[PDB]
């Protein structure tokens, strides 16, 4: 009896979404000049990891970034002079994610052990020691994003997200509703909402303070691997195993553009945006990175220097450069 | 060029590099294996034998040593049923041990499907599988009793003849050898019907309480590495 009512509600929502559409983004963006051809070449190459690099994150100051490797190591590098500031060994070798505090005083990591470990960088003794160990998830940790040095949001492979409290160690809020395991996370610019993407071709919008689900976006035909927010804060871009990228907007509750090509068959592992939102960078399985025009949805550039699958990719806070990390255990920086 | 403090930072980075080199030397000399099996075989007992000779933990590791060679074995713990996402972390392991309970034929097709799924995988190519036909003690009793027997689970039985290669020294009658070699030929068909030249399969006949289980793994890993090195030089 509830199946029919759910079907009726879904049909009503679909009709309401169809009604609000009058034109498309391609028609409106048809009469402006293109961006031309983009030439980016590597400036720095960072070496020192032993196995494939699973994640990375840039600091607030745009000079220090942290990388995580599956040999069981975290490394904190200096970007300008290529120096190594810290090298931290972990208790588990299967680390799938890592984040950096906005304050710059802590670091987080986690993996197949279902524990989120928080390390303190500013210690009276000249060493880095683990300060907290958050437990309570019943699956591997996929992503973690940090908040005001005392709160952290984590997504897990048991189809749940959690808002924690480092001081006490207890989790304050739990977000449920996904069917497949959650693979990525992006905080809103105003850190009042956040979107998540799961392995059932669906993304969801979450309110941090209330703890409830606001909207659900379904436009993909396979599991979603990466997701992020448009600088303005009113739209998001996602990446899926169907070799296509999609752009959604919160205000209209719809999908605006699809980025795909005929020759591309592999999957998409990471998605990023430019400081002005014009460009969209995406890492692919065929050892390549692609740079797309976000408005005209026309391929604009490409990247290389990687001999294996590209896993992580991130743009700096001021828009100066972009960092890439693949499964050959090398990190590259491009202007 | 550099100021008085830049040189100290450079020296600190060099020291970190030296420590990383030592860790690389230690990390290159161990072998990692992945253990797999259902909640029907004696995988826990096989682990217990080697280990004697946290509330929601995700993975368990056991270390052992054969002829001064270190082996690390990982098996997953509190994880969900779907495994198509975390199986990509193990694309650079020496081998995958796969334990199958061959006593019951009620759920043998599920084991065959699991083996086929593991064999054909985009990221699990060039990885060799060591097969453990465990609990081949209740199998003989099940065959001898006759209350339950392979008659309708698989329709191709009673039309199979034992190949002229078996070495059935331990046995009471020549009727369990045919059944166990039929099971072995079952899993061996999937491995022989797919991509070859990159990875192989190494079957065994084991019982859960056995004395020689680490030596078989030692021998199979020796064979795997030797074949890779003999194929990198066009000698094979």
């Amino acid at each position, epitope marked *: 009896q509830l199946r029919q009512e759910a079907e009726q509600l879904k049909n009503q929502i679909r009709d309401a979404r169809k009604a609000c559409a009058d034109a498309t983004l391609s028609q409106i963006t048809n009469n402006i000049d293109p961006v031309g051809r983009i030439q980016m070449r590597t400036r720095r190459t960072l070496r020192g990891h032993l196995a494939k690099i699973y994640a990375m994150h840039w600091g607030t100051d745009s000079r*220090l970034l942290v990388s995580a490797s599956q040999d069981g190591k975290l490394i904190i590098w200096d970007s300008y002079t290529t*120096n190594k500031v810290h090298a931290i060994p972990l208790r588990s070798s299967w680390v799938m994610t890592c984040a950096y505090a906005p304050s710059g005083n802590y670091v987080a990591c986690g993996g197949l052990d279902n524990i989120c470990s928080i390390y303190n960088l500013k210690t009276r*003794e*000249g060493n880095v020691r683990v300060s907290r160990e958050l437990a309570g998830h019943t699956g591997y940790l996929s992503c973690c994003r940090f908040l005001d040095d005392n709160q952290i949001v984590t997504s897990s492979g048991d189809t749940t997200c959690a808002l924690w409290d480092i001081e006490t160690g207890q989790q304050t809020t739990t977000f449920t509703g996904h069917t497949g395991d959650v693979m990525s996370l992006s905080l809103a610019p105003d850190t009042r909402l956040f979107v998540s993407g799961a392995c059932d071709a669906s993304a969801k919008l979450w309110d941090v303070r209330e703890g409830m689900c606001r909207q659900t976006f379904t436009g993909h035909e396979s599991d979603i691997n990466a997701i992020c927010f448009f600088p303005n804060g009113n739209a998001f871009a996602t990446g899926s195993d169907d070799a296509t990228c999609r752009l959604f907007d919160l205000r209209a509750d719809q999908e605006l553009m699809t980025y795909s090509h005929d020759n591309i068959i592999c999957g998409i592992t990471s998605v990023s945006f430019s400081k002005s939102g014009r460009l969209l960078l995406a890492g692919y399985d065929d050892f390549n990175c692609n740079v797309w025009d976000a408005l005209k949805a026309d391929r604009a550039g490409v990247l290389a220097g990687h001999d294996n699958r590209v896993s992580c990719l991130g743009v700096t806070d001021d828009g100066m450069a972009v960092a890439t990390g693949s499964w050959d255990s090398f990190l590259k920086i491009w202007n | 060029t550099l100021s*008085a*403090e830049d040189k*100290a*930072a450079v020296e600190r980075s060099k*020291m970190i590099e030296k420590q990383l080199q030592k860790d690389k030397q230690v990390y290159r000399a161990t072998h990692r294996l992945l253990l797999l099996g259902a909640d029907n075989s004696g995988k826990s007992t096989i682990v217990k034998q080697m280990r004697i000779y946290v509330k929601t933990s995700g993975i368990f590791e056991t270390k052992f040593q054969v002829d001064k060679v270190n082996f690390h074995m990982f098996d997953v713990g509190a994880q969900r049923d779907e495994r198509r996402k975390w199986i990509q972390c193990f694309n650079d392991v020496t081998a995958i041990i796969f334990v199958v309970d061959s006593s019951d034929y009620n759920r043998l097709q599920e084991a065959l499907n699991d083996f086929k799924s593991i064999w054909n995988n985009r990221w699990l190519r060039t990885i060799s599988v060591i097969l453990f036909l465990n609990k081949q003690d209740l199998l003989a009793e099940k065959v001898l009793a006759g209350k339950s027997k392979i008659e309708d689970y698989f329709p191709e039985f009673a039309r199979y003849t034992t190949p002229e290669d078996a070495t059935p020294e331990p046995g009471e009658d020549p009727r369990v050898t045919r059944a166990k070699y039929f099971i072995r030929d079952e899993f061996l068909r999937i491995s022989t019907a797919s991509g070859d030249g990159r990875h192989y399969c190494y079957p065994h006949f084991t019982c859960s309480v056995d004395t020689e289980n680490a030596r078989r793994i030692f021998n199979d890993c020796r064979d795997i590495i030797q074949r890779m090195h003999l194929r990198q030089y066009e000698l094979l």
Partner: single-chain antibody
Amino acid sequence: VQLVESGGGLVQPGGSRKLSCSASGFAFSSFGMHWVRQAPEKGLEWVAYISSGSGTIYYADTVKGRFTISRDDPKNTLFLQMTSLRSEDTAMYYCVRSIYYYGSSPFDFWGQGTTLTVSASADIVMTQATSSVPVTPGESVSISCRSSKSLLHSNGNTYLYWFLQRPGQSPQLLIYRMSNLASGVPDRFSGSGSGTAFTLTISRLEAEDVGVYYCMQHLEYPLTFGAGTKLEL
């Protein structure tokens, strides 16, 4: 964190002595160490520097061929061997730690010191404005330091340090790199400069600011301190 100094006493001219520095409470092997001496009624004077891993050693020009510095990492100890003690080597010696990487703060802990008595160049120079300042509680005070070279480097750092020594105590870090507050120093203190002239400002003077204030440079390895400025309440 603790550093304890052993050795000293009364020595005859032409003799020899050994001084020990024992560290407890922090990772001794990750820090570089310095010796800093102070005359009975004068300022401070940097003496010797030992790096981390014992890969670099620096000496002052006046003690180049007489003093030796060494480490014992497993036992967490620092050694200074002194030979042919003259009458100008009668000073109180302090053990200092410092760690160098991106964003660190060197010279952030000093020992208590030990006392030793003996019976009978193109380098940067720093000048303190005045040797005394009469002020009252509750008001604002300003101190000045000057240099003979532009302490600003090409990267963008300045390398100027402000230390304070209270009566009957040891120096403590106040300001590092001319615009950064120390770990637990009160917010009232401030620092500023322009490349050649530098100024330290105290906004709301209190009872505990009484002492001698020193500036110091770290652009080059020959380390000069200066004379300092005294404050009286």
